[PDB]
Amino acid sequence: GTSQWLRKTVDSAAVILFSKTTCPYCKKVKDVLAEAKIKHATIELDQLSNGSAIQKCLASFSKIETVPQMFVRGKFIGDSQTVLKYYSNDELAGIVNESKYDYDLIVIGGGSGGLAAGKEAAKYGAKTAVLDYVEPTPIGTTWGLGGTCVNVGCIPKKLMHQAGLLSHALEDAEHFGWSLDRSKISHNWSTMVEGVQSHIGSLNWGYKVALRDNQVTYLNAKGRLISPHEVQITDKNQKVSTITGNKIILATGERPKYPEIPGAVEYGITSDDLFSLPYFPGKTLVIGASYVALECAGFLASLGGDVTVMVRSILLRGFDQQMAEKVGDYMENHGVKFAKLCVPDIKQLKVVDTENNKPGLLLVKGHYTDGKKFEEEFETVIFAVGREPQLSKVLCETVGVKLDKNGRVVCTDDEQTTVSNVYAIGDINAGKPQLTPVAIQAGRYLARRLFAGATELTDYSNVATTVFTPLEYGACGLSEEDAIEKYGDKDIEVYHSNFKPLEWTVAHEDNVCYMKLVCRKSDNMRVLGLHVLGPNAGEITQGYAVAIKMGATKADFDRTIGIHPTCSETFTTLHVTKKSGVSPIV
Amino acid sequence: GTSQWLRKTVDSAAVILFSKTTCPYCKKVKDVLAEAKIKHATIELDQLSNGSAIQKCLASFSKIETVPQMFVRGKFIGDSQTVLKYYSNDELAGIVNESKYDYDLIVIGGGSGGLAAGKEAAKYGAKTAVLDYVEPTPIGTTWGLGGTCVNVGCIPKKLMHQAGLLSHALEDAEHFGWSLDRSKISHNWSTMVEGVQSHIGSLNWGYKVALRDNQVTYLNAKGRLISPHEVQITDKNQKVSTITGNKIILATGERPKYPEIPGAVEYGITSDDLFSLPYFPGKTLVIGASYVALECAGFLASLGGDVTVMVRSILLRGFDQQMAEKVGDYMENHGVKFAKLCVPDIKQLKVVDTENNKPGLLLVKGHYTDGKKFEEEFETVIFAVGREPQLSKVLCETVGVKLDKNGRVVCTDDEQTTVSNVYAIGDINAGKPQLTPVAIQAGRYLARRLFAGATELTDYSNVATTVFTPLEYGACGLSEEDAIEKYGDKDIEVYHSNFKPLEWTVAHEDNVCYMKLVCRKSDNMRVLGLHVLGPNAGEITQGYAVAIKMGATKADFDRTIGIHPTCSETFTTLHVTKKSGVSPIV
Ligand SMILES: Cc1cc2nc3c(=O)[nH]c(=O)nc-3n(C[C@H](O)[C@H](O)[C@H](O)COP(=O)(O)OP(=O)(O)OC[C@H]3O[C@@H](n4cnc5c(N)ncnc54)[C@H](O)[C@@H]3O)c2cc1C
Ligand SMILES: Cc1cc2nc3c(=O)[nH]c(=O)nc-3n(C[C@H](O)[C@H](O)[C@H](O)COP(=O)(O)OP(=O)(O)OC[C@H]3O[C@@H](n4cnc5c(N)ncnc54)[C@H](O)[C@@H]3O)c2cc1C
Ligand SMILES: CCOc1ccc(CC(=O)O)cc1
Numbered sequence A, B: 001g002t003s004q005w006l007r008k009t010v011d012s013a014a015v016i017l018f019s020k021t022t023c024p025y026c027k028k029v030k031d032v033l034a035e036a037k038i039k040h041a042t043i044e045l046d047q048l049s050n051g052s053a054i055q056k057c058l059a060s061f062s063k064i065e066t067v068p069q070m071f072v073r074g075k076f077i078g079d080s081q082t083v084l085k086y087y088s089n090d091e092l093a094g095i096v097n098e099s100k101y102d103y104d105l106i107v108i109g110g111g112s113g114g115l116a117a118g119k120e121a122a123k124y125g126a127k128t129a130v131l132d133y134v135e136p137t138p139i140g141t142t143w144g145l146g147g148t149c150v151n152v153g154c155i156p157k158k159l160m161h162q163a164g165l166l167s168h169a170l171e172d173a174e175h176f177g178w179s180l181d182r183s184k185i186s187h188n189w190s191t192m193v194e195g196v197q198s199h200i201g202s203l204n205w206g207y208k209v210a211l212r213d214n215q216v217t218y219l220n221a222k223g224r225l226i227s228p229h230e231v232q233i234t235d236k237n238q239k240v241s242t243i244t245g246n247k248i249i250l251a252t253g254e255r256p257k258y259p260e261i262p263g264a265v266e267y268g269i270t271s272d273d274l275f276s277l278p279y280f281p282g283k284t285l286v287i288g289a290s291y292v293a294l295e296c297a298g299f300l301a302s303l304g305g306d307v308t309v310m311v312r313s314i315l316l317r318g319f320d321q322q323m324a325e326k327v328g329d330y331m332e333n334h335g336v337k338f339a340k341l342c343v344p345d346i347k348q349l350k351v352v353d354t355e356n357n358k359p360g361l362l363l364v365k366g367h368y369t370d371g372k373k374f375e376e377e378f379e380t381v382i383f384a385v386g387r388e389p390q391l392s393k394v395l396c397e398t399v400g401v402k403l404d405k406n407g408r409v410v411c412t413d414d415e416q417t418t419v420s421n422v423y424a425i426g427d428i429n430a431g432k433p434q435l436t437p438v439a440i441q442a443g444r445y446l447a448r449r450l451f452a453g454a455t456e457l458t459d460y461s462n463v464a465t466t467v468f469t470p471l472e473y474g475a476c477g478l479s480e481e482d483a484i485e486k487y488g489d490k491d492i493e494v495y496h497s498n499f500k501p502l503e504w505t506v507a508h509e510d511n512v513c514y515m516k517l518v519c520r521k522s523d524n525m526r527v528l529g530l531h532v533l534g535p536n537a538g539e540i541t542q543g544y545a546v547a548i549k550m551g552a553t554k555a556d557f558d559r560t561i562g563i564h565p566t567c568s569e570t571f572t573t574l575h576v577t578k579k580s581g582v583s584p585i586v
């Protein structure tokens, strides 16, 4: 296997140096490279078990077995004498810049995954370009560099969640002795939006600075892969040109879907528009039941909105359904209305007032499964009915990249597509969890395999999640119903408990927060899934994901001592099983 | 070993049944016991690897080898026929109540550990009494059942920490769009105290109800162990009597120390008095540098107090000193003054006004190591200079219980004292971490070994902690300096990073929150200590304690994916080492 790895590493690395830590001839080459500002990867053979064997395999390319050995784009360049010869004759810069292609790496898409891959690749001498373009929404909304999470996703959504949580902080403060009266305080949407957008703007600018500081070429242009190594770009002035690259990373993400009903595209909005909206939505209808739908409905209600969610069937399809129902019950008891078993069939009553920054007015007609008609007026209608890629705008079908039935890219476990120099990461990689830290880990780990000879793969199993509804829901691993389907009801034991945050006592609910561990009896009570509904649920859940990755059992949870007073410590003392029928209430 | 375990189990259990899950004769005995309301332990031999061997060892007591076998206080009572004979003749209740002693267990001390041990023991048929008495402070303060944490410790301190955190929530809410002006809002101390004390009162009452519901005798009396099995009790009317018990658990805790200077006991207060104080402390001096000292100084300043901390030498002796200095720097930048390298030499200027609920006024004289005099007026002076047991008031020295030089009880790893029926748990157990969840785990696990034949010991290693200062500090495992002392500087690698909570962006500090992993190079980069300074630090830290208990390495942290956006996810991507000299700032 050693020989196969070395051949792949030499073929793909842009600039790479084989070395030993204790060799003065290697030091001399490093100093020349440092002075000339030549970035490169380095592999220290004296820190590898099979380093002696690698030293022999190197002779298949260089006909020598000593260190140092320097390679550029698959070609042996020289030992120490030869490298210093090139440097002394002012020939070295031209050798390390020689390529059949314009770039070692072209990244199509400047989001979570693409920016992480491009920055990491450039560290090892890969000449890199990042392409990013934001097709405007139907009403014209657009934004800067950084992708979905930065501009219209995790970042603004959690900041508006925090604004909503602060409504209940204001209420709590009265009970803890502060002299304010919450019922006399109001919220100003546009003041919130301006502060959120100023933070987003600092991130757009920080990414541009980071790319320039890493010598990455940033092009604000739409990319299209027309052959394995050729990318056609269209710029802001609609000028069309072509650039070539050795490795290609597709990282173009997804966009919101709309239902195929009259008025939907003309008069409704999506999450893409919500986070920069210049007016407060007012009385709002959210159509959908995804985590995006419930997160947005939740903070709009906490900011004083009259909010309704229209649910076709169930909440949070794909998540543990006991936990999903508890999430929804909390919202319904705290100001969110639900139109259940209902679908839409949108009429305009008032145009948006762009001068006084006020919403319009819409009539929504729909129907319930029991035959009743739905007809109600709303100032704003938000569609959260899923997201999809549009790779036909990105990828000419004659290139040979395989897609699945949902339009996502079919990859091997190292992110390789059916075209061997082309890779796909992030939301468009079929079958993978669609999360920002997954995209970042995939992109950074792939850059190291391509340009630094690394072997580590990304591990996509048991990736922890948190839904940032008014009461947050964190999870790691299998739902209870999925565990029972996979292993049988007789092999599953479930420990559970309600709890109450100490913070909620003086603030005046008892038995609403909830947690459970889903375990496998025949495998030493291995923890298969962890679930918690409560405040700060993402901070609670994160550390347990390390223990689950290492194969934690119920016994491991039992022997660990709790930190007091915290919500998380309740996981360390669980004892009530579902099989026993004993109530989980306090 | 099996034979040794069985002999210890039979000798100590109050009422115990040896059984198999699939035996109808065992079921008949269980049903008789259930009907007569006889609580007992049960050991199902068909779920134990050595169950066949136990069945043979049982014949050393009963001369039979079949199940069921029932034992009471070390004596074989009967098989199924014999038990039903006693029941039919109305003889069973008298047999299971027969004892040489008044109680199977007497717990001296009704705090975290003692209440947990007493409740658990009663579940297995142990006739139990819990003794609790609260000696008043010098100014006369006293409180109800539940011990230090419930009444004058973790519970009120974290609730007043929450009141302090809500001051910064009120400030943050303006930036997130809410229409309040923080500079016009004030805090009412006595309103806060009344709400905190109403929650504490519900806990005092809940413990009394829980003891009655478990058939535990609660005596509000001071206990003194005068011989191995005899406890002399003094009640509220000063009546003195004696009760006897088979097993004794000492669980009497500690109380605050005072410095030996004029005026200290007469005019100062301690944490015992602070949490029910009927007046706002006003301008306050905290003498001390423990976690109690800094937690109390921190919330008093956030509630609008003019607060000074007088520090003899260093902050948080025994904790990681880099982290302790960061804790202190945050406080000094956020309204707490520090009188460094200073000690006190207290004069009264004004008596406390108990009618208008206002503080008095004190003159504090002291001196600095550089020779300068300290002289300043304060309305309240709080001593936080350590805690100590007073076991000579609890334990007659002729009984034979060994104490260490600090007056704490010297125990084996199963909490046994040098008197073999006497055990010690909680803060008075020498060498153990002095924390509430440790006391609870020790007490519950000991009750199961005494009365249900369990073998599990409490694990006191790598117990995680959190200091609830204005910016919280969570830790699990070794400090950096302790790791380097134990293993050598060359065998230690430290990964670290600053971070910024997303919540702090719109609210307007960058590089103040901080985390680090202290690892051992020669043991696969094993994580020896984890440290985090940031919001919700106890929720962050707790889950990682399970992974550290299982022997997590840096590689385990790397392969686990983060949850976004959270503070805790920064642990999953650490890469800067201290050895490299690269800055940890963002
Ligand atoms: C409302 C919402 C909330 C979310 N909240 C969370 C959360 O709390 N936590 C979490 O982990 N994840 C969250 N996510 C998911 C997270 O945003 C995505 O998983 C992540 O953005 C995926 O990154 P990516 O690199 O695959 O693509 P993206 O971030 O979508 O980046 C792709 C970029 O490429 C551009 N592009 C597309 N086609 C082309 C082309 N032809 N040429 C040039 N550029 C092109 C796009 O315009 C975009 O800028 C949320 C998503 C949404 C919608
Ligand atoms: C200010 C402060 C804050 C703290 N915060 C935390 C925190 O956040 N987290 C944490 O884990 N720990 C915290 N602790 C520590 C925690 O309170 C203790 O570790 C815990 O209370 C130990 O319990 P115990 O059962 O050993 O004793 P205790 O809880 O002290 O109970 C002993 C009881 O026995 C009584 N007693 C004594 N002598 C006799 C006698 N002769 N007869 C009858 N009764 C008697 C005492 O009056 C008392 O009621 C804090 C402590 C303090 C002081
Ligand atoms: C546009 C590319 O179309 C493809 C469709 C399917 C495959 C299936 C396979 O790899 O066997 C490959 C390529």
Ligand SMILES: CCOc1ccc(CC(=O)O)cc1
Residues within 6 Å of the ligand: B397, B398, B399, B400, B401, B402, B403, B418
């Ligand atoms: C009051 C009891 O005094 C003791 C003091 C010391 C020991 C030391 C030992 O156990 O060897 C035991 C008992």
